[PDB]
Every structure is written in structure tokens, then in C-alpha cells.
Design a protein around this ligand. Structure first.
Ligand SMILES: [Mg+2]
Ligand SMILES: [Mg+2]
Ligand SMILES: [Mg+2]
Ligand SMILES: [Zn+2]
Length: 889
């Protein structure tokens, strides 16, 4: 079991200058011929030549056109091809090989594979070695000359990186295409696509150089009409990188291709970005609203990698956050600018605080730059991506827009066309920090701890106000709990964006201020503060931390109503709910523990309910923001605050709180549901493929949120609203009608209606599957059995498997059924999936991440299932490593 260490990085004793590939696609096999023009590096110590090569069938291998003899000159163990040093030349040489691979049976979706009738590659991170032999690591930069041959009728469209230099006919109904890509690239960015693809195209003219760029978006014929939004998103991404960063696309063409079978969202292969169909295709008739924001973010993300990942490369896989964290940060800036809705930033914070905080307090906790790995694929995490994006975003908060843009340009100019590390990025930002602070002694050495220290910091406050002195003090403390990665945690450089609200009039008392907390504790004093303020802390969620505001609910209500910052208002509401949840949770738990015949529950704060009503009734307030305020915090956010969490007691606590609020606001919720109809469901632009209105989609989110609240409350005659909602032309509405009808006798009637509406579109059927999976049904186990038998069957499509099972794992009462039946069900699916797709089997482990945070009985049931999965003789290296780390073994 090999463990790779970050501190062990050493450049290779070899160089690969040129790759010349011939990929011959046939009915039952693909033949791959490859010539590597190689050299000996200055780091060479006369070692054996070792190539990565996984599952390759060797026809022949040669050095300088001399065939090598198996056993005497080379060994191959289905993982590593070792050429004994005595047979390796001492100067420039050619290594050649001919191997056979089988894309048709490649269900792992890594290397070269078949997705429906499209042949497609996936090389990141270690997939290139599944195509041909290589020193499969990102610092091995080479030029690529690639020829693809295939049956013309089955595969008329052939694509790879670089310029298409030749197209030729081959006897027997075959054809070929040659692509030459002269700029150096790592092998993970190589890609090839063959299929009967249809396209939409456009020309984009760059801002400064005025270069004409050809943009092509591809899919199978049936779904070509769903590519228009992706094309608009690509134009928007190009414009944003030019406008904000002054960055222009350098190539003559950019291809985007949608495939049905994909492990993740998309992949940034140079000039040939490949996408999960669910992250590229959409139509107003056949997609839910979420598809629009998803395509915008994913198209944006892969486009932004052209600089942060493609032009500026990674030295090694330990630097992953350098491309992933930075690109998620670029994607988030872009989406905030494109949507112009406060909910975009809130959605990012909601994701981090629920999912990433759970990971950071779990046995899987790691820094954004880990010190070791066994399985590289298990490094692609919410910590590396999302905490990494927040670490990248803190540089912008610290420096401000002007100096951040200066530091970013320094990073690009210094590292363009080269490999880079997290230190190179920090160095560039430090140069901008020195410029901003107007002193060359200033540094960001302490900032590096954000890359090496795991765990979420806790930031707590105490306040003081002297009315006579007009002097206000904010005492701040930071603390990170020790974990398995560091016995001793050090204080971080934490930027605290702050405001001071006058409680008398809700006005700002001070200008924009970012407190730079660099010690374990500090006291920040403010003079000429005329009245005791209410502090607005961590505006825009300025640091990825647990905020302990120490404010009363009266102060939190005033911020919720009057503060200027969307995050602080949202957070103040979150904190009020958390204080209520913890109180009622303890009250129900004590009643259950003591077997009480009667007991009391603390009611929901009446002034808090009044504030929710005030905000909901405000016609000038944001519909997206309103949907957050009426929703309780996520279960995965709540679990970070409760030890030995009893899921039944939490379900009872949530039910009580929602009923308490609904008993006062249902008539308001109903009135709003009806009044929002006209604007939310406006059909004016339904047949305009490019007209996307994020505010209108948020108005639909609010209506669908209110309808769910009203249906759960059994609001008088709400079933009439539900049935009418099922007739809407918008899938977000008609699929909502299915989910909310779970509380009524008409559920199966809507189940059949919505299935009929969804069945003829691959992606919409996956959305219908998700809706069914998350339906709050008492007969959910019987329903999942019906989906398996009638719809899912033996599908190996990751979108199908994930749609049926993952939404169900969010069902608090049912997935966590005390018998352990839900844990048993998901473990059976993990083990079955692991046989063909280890990466998807590991994704399916997601509900087990919080195992040691639940009540002792559920901890025991989850652990038993993970130990059963670990005992499987055929377990993959990926799943084994993941479960060993998760179970602290
Ligand atoms: Mg094979
Ligand atoms: Mg422009
Ligand atoms: Mg299918
Ligand atoms: Zn990425």
C-alpha cells in the first residue's frame, strides 16, 4: 500500500518532449500506437525506466525501433512497465509501444471509454496511463501529435486538442483525423472524442488582440437544441475573464462536448472541455431552474482553468487547491456578477458550512494542501475545492480589488507556461500586500498556515461600550480544535469585515473596515461611537470559520431587519434558529431519556416570527433571501453543534419549530404564494432560449418553498393549489407538485403524471428520480424498490444511480431508521457500484461521513455496515482507503 508524501517531491530522471499517438477505434477493441521522444534529465541517477500503464494489453514495445524482449529487458505487472536501466539509452531516444484497450467495457469512466454511442477520454488525474504508457504526473510537459481513426458512419466527428491538420479516408468505411498541439501540456489535459455529434457554433472576438475564436458546443443529435444556454455561458465566461482579469483566450477554437456517462460535472481538457450532460444541456420545457445556474457555473469553471490550471500548471497533485480552489473562487466571482442576486454568495456559504464543516470535523479532515495520499482521486474534496476557494477569496478581502488584481496579474505573468505551487501564489499576493501596506518588510508567511492547517477555526467575541467616552471595543478570540493532523494548532491570519449598526436608526456608523486578526486574541477599539452599536461581523462571510457572535436574539433580529450585509442578516437568522433548535432538541431528548408523561417546550421567539413576517411582506425585499429566512438551517450544519445526535429527536425539534412559525404565518405564506404567481411563472420569454432571469427563478424558489411549508402544515384546501401547480409548464413547479403531494392521497396520481412528462428526456428523468427519492413518504422503502425494478434496473450510469439514492439519504426520519435498513441499503449499493466504478462507489459513501456524530446506536449500525463493506474480498483501492480513513483504522 504505497503512500506518497508532499515533502518527497523530486523531478523525474527522464524527459518526454513529444507524444505521437495513433488511436485506432474498432468494434471490439481500440489499438493505441504511441511514440515518445524522450531524453535523460539532470536528475537521472541511472535508474530503471518506469512507465505507468494500467490494464494495457501489450502487443509490442520498442526503444529506437528495436523490439524489446519480455522478462529479459522489461517486466509489466498491469500497473508499471519497468525497462531495466542497462537497456535504457544515455541520450535522446524514442520509446514506442502498441497496446490494446477496450472502451466498450470501461465502466469506471476513466481512461478511454464509451458513453452511449460516444467514445470519450477522461485523464485527470491518473487516467492517461489507462490509454498508453507514460510517466503519468503533471510536471511531465510534452507536445502532442494525435491521429484518431474510426468507422465513418458510427463516428463522423473526431476531436482532440490543438489544430485539426489533416482529414483522410481509410479503406473499409473508415476515416481519420490528425490533430497537432504544439504548446507543452501535462498528460491529464489530453482528450479525444469520437461520435455522431451535432453542434451549435458562434464566433467570439477577443477584447484586446481582436482574435477571432470559433466556439463549438456538441451533443448527441436528440439533445442538440438544449445547447444554446451553454453557448451563451461560454461567451459570458470569456467576457468576464477579459473584463475582471484582463485575460483573453489564446487558441483559435474552444470545443465543449456533452456526454451521458461522467463521474463528475466537467473537465478542462485544453480546447476540448468535456461535460456531464447534466452540466451542459438545458431547455425551459425539459429542465428544472437549477440547471441554468449549474451550466453557468460549470461552463465558467472549466473556462477559467484555461489560465488557472492549463496555462499555469500544477507541479504535483499536492498543489490541487492551487487550480481547484482558485478556479472555484474565479467561478464564484463570475456567478455573483452574472446572477446579480445575493443568494449566489449565500448558496456558497450554505454549501461550505454544512458539507465542508462536517468534513473538517470528521475523521476525513485534511488541510487544503494535504501532506500525503494513497488514492489521488480521494483529494478531490469539498475542503480542497470550497475551503480552498474561501482561502483564495480571503486574499481579495485583505488586498481589496485593485491590489488583488495586481497580485493576480503578478501570479500569471511570472508563472504562465510553467508548473507552479501554492507558495508561488502566496508570493504573488505578498508582493501586492507589500505595495498595499507601503512597506517591503510586510509578509504573508503566517497566511501559509491556511494551506497546511486542518480544522475549522472558531472565532468568538466580547464587547464593551463606554457611553461617556463614546468608545467601543471588540475583543476577538480564535481557536482551532486539535485533530489527527496537528496536536498544536497555530493562530491564523483572519480578516474580519465589519460594520457597526446604530440600533436607533439602522444606519452605518463606520466606513468599510477589515479587522486583521493575526494573534490568538486581540482587542479592536473604535473612538467617536455616539451610541452603543450592534456589530455586523464577518460581512460577506469574510473567513471560513465558526462565528460565535455572542449577540442577544433582540440584536440578531435588528441585524436581520436593518443590516446592509446579506450574509450577516442570513447569519443572524441562522443563529436565532440554532439557539432555538439546541434548546428544543435538549427538551425533547430529556423527555425521551426520562420517559416523561408530560413536559414543556420553549416556544419560538415571537419578535423573531414578527421580523420574518415584516421581511416577507416587504415588496422591495429579495425573493431568494426570503426563501432562506423561512427555512431552518441544513441538518448537516446542525450536526456540528450537537454531540451524539439523535436523528429522531432532531426531526421532532424541526417539526415543532416549523409548526410554531406556520401557526402564526401560514395565511401570510398563502397570500404570498398566490400574489407571486404572475411574476414567478411569467411565460413571456419561455420560447427565448437565451433569456435567463435569476430573479424570476428565485421567485419560483420562494413559491415552491412556501407551497412545501403549506402542504406539510395541511393548510386548508392546499391540495387544489398542488393539482394546479402540476399543470405548470416549468419542471421546477411540476416536480415540486409531485414532492409536496407526498402528504396527500393524490401522490401516486402525480407520480404517474410527472413520470410521463419526464420519461422522454434522459436528464429530466434523472430529475424525476431525484424528486421521488427525496419525497417525504412513509412507504419510501417500497417506492425505492419500485424505482429499482421499473426505472433504474442494472444501469451503470452515475447520474441514474446517484439520482435514485443520494436524495433519499437526506431523509432524516427514514434514511436513519433505527433498524439500520437505510444504512444496509446504501452499503449494498456502494458494494455493487464498487465492482465497476470505484469513484462513484466512494461518492455514494457520503451519508456515512457523519457516522461518529450520531447517537450511540446509529454510530454502531453505520460502523457495522462500513466494516461489512471493508470485508468485501473484491473491494477497490479507492473504497478501501476511504473507509479505512473514515473508520479511523
Ligand atoms: Mg485492459
Ligand atoms: Mg466585452
Ligand atoms: Mg441512459
Ligand atoms: Zn476544476
Amino acid at each position: 500500500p504505497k503512500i506518497h508524501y508532499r515533502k518527497d517531491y523530486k523531478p523525474s530522471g527522464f524527459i518526454i518532449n513529444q507524444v505521437t499517438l495513433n488511436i485506432n477505434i474498432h468494434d471490439q477493441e481500440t489499438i493505441v500506437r504511441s511514440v515518445l521522444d524522450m531524453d535523460i534529465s539532470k536528475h537521472n541517477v541511472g535508474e530503471d525506466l518506469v512507465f505507468d500503464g494500467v490494464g494495457l494489453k501489450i502487443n509490442e514495445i520498442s526503444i529506437n525501433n528495436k523490439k524489446l524482449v519480455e522478462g529479459e529487458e522489461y517486466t509489466y505487472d498491469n500497473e508499471f512497465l519497468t525497462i531495466f536501466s542497462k537497456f535504457v539509452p544515455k541520450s535522446k531516444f524514442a520509446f514506442s509501444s502498441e497496446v490494446i484497450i477496450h472502451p466498450e467495457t470501461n465502466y469506471a469512466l476513466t481512461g478511454l471509454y464509451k458513453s452511449k454511442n460516444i467514445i470519450v477520454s477522461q485523464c485527470e488525474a491518473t487516467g492517461f496511463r489507462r490509454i498508453t504508457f507514460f510517466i503519468d504526473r503533471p510536471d511531465m510537459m510534452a507536445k502532442y501529435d494525435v491521429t484518431v481513426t474510426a468507422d465513418k458512419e458510427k463516428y463522423p466527428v473526431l476531436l482532440s486538442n490543438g489544430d485539426k491538420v489533416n482529414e483522410f479516408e481509410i479503406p473499409g468505411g473508415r476515416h481519420g483525423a490528425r490533430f497537432n498541439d504544439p504548446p507543452l501540456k501535462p498528460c491529464y489535459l489530453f482528450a479525444v472524442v469520437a461520435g455522431d455529434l451535432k453542434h451549435l457554433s458562434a464566433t467570439y472576438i477577443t477584447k484586446y488582440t481582436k482574435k477571432k475564436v470559433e466556439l463549438y458546443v456538441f451533443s448527441e443529435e436528440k439533445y442538440v437544441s438544449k445547447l444554446q444556454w451553454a453557448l451563451e455561458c461560454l461567451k459570458k465566461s470569456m467576457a468576464f475573464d477579459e473584463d475582471y482579469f484582463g485575460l483573453e483566450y489564446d487558441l483559435s477554437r474552444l470545443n465543449l462536448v456533452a456526454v451521458s456517462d461522467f463521474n463528475v460535472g466537467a473537465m478542462e481538457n485544453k480546447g476540448l472541455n468535456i461535460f456531464n450532460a447534466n452540466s451542459l444541456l438545458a431547455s425551459k420545457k425539459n429542465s428544472i431552474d437549477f440547471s441554468y445556474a449549474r451550466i453557468l457555473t460549470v461552463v465558467g469553471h472549466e473556462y477559467f482553468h484555461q489560465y488557472t490550471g492549463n496555462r499555469v500548471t500544477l507541479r504535483d497533485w499536492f498543489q490541487l487547491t492551487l487550480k481547484e480552489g482558485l478556479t472555484v473562487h474565479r467561478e464564484n466571482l463570475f456567478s455573483e456578477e452574472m446572477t446579480k442576486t445575493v443568494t449566489t454568495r449565500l448558496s456558497h456559504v450554505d454549501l461550505l458550512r454544512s458539507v465542508q464543516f462536517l468534513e473538517d470535523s470528521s475523521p476525513l479532515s485534511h488541510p487544503i494542501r494535504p501532506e500525503s495520499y494513497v488514492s489521488m482521486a480521494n483529494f478531490y474534496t469539498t475542503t480542497v475545492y470550497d475551503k480552498g476557494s474561501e482561502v483564495m477569496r480571503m486574499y481579495l478581502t485583505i488586498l481589496g480589488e485593485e491590489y488583488y488584481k495586481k497580485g493576480f496579474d503578478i501570479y500569471i505573468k511570472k508563472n504562465d507556461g510553467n508548473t507552479a505551487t501554492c507558495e508561488d501564489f502566496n508570493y504573488a499576493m505578498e508582493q501586492a500586500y507589500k505595495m498595499k501596506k507601503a512597506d517591503n518588510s510586510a509578509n504573508l508567511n503566517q497566511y501559509l498556515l491556511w494551506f497546511s492547517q486542518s480544522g475549522t477555526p472558531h472565532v468568538s467575541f466580547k464587547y464593551n461600550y463606554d457611553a461617556e467616552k463614546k468608545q467601543y471595543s471588540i475583543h476577538v478570540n480564535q481557536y482551532t480544535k486539535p485533530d489527527e493532523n496537528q496536536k498544536e494548532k497555530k493562530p491564523l491570519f483572519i480578516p474580519i469585515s465589519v460594520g457597526l449598526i446604530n440600533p436607533e436608526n439602522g444606519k452605518e456608523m463606520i466606513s468599510q473596515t477589515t479587522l486583521e486578526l493575526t494573534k490568538e486574541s486581540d482587542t479592536f477599539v473604535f473612538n467617536n461611537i455616539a451610541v452603543k452599536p450592534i456589530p455586523s461581523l464577518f460581512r460577506g462571510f469574510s473567513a471560513p470559520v465558526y462565528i460565535e457572535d455572542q449577540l442577544t436574539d433582540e440584536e440578531r433580529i435588528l441585524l436581520l431587519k436593518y443590516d446592509s450585509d446579506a450574509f450577516v442578516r442570513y447569519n443572524s437568522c441562522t443563529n436565532i434558529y440554532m439557539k432555538q433548535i439546541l434548546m428544543n432538541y435538549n427538551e425533547f431528548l430529556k423527555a425521551k431519556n426520562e420517559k416523561l408523561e408530560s413536559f414543556q417546550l420553549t416556544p419560538v421567539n415571537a419578535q423573531f416570527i414578527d421580523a420574518i413576517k415584516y421581511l416577507l411582506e416587504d415588496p422591495h425585499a429579495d425573493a431568494g433571501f426570503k426563501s432562506y429566512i423561512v427555512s431552518l438551517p441544513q441538518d448537516r450544519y446542525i450536526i456540528n453543534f450537537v454531540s451524539n445526535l439523535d436523528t429522531d429527536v432532531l426531526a421532532d425539534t424541526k417539526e415543532y419549530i416549523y409548526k410554531q412559525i406556520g401557526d402564526k404565518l401560514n395565511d401570510v405564506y398563502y397570500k404570498m404564494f398566490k400574489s407571486l404567481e404572475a411574476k414567478a411563472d411569467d411565460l413571456t420569454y419561455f420560447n427565448d432560449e437565451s433569456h435567463v432571469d435569476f430573479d424570476q427563478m428565485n421567485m419560483r424558489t420562494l413559491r415552491n418553498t412556501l407551497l412545501s411549508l403549506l402542504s406539510k402544515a395541511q393548510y386548508p384546501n392546499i391540495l387544489n393549489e398542488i393539482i394546479e401547480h402540476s399543470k405548470s409548464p416549468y419542471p421546477s413547479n411540476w416536480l415540486t407538485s409531485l414532492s409536496v403531494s407526498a402528504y396527500f392521497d393524490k401522490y401516486f396520481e402525480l407520480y404517474d403524471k410527472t413520470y410521463k412528462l419526464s420519461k422522454d428526456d434522459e436528464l429530466l428523468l434523472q430529475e424525476w428520480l431525484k424528486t421521488v427519492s427525496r419525497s417525504d413518504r412513509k412507504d419510501i422503502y417500497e417506492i425505492l424498490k419500485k424505482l429499482e425494478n421499473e426505472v433504474l434496473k442494472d444501469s451503470k450510469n452515475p447520474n441514474d444511480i446517484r439520482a435514485v439514492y443520494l436524495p433519499f439519504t437526506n431523509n432524516l426520519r427514514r434514511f436513519h431508521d433505527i433498524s439500520g435498513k437505510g444504512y444496509k441499503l446504501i452499503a449494498e449499493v456502494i458494494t455493487k457500484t464498487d465492482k465497476f466504478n470505484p469513484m462513484v462507489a466512494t461518492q455514494l459513501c457520503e451519508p456515512f461521513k457523519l457516522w461518529n456524530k450520531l447517537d450511540t446506536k446509529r454510530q454502531e449500525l453505520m460502523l457495522n455496515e462500513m466494516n461489512t463493506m471493508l470485508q468485501e474480498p473484491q473491494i477497490s483501492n479507492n473504497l478501501k482507503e476511504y473507509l479505512l480513513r473514515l473508520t479511523n483504522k
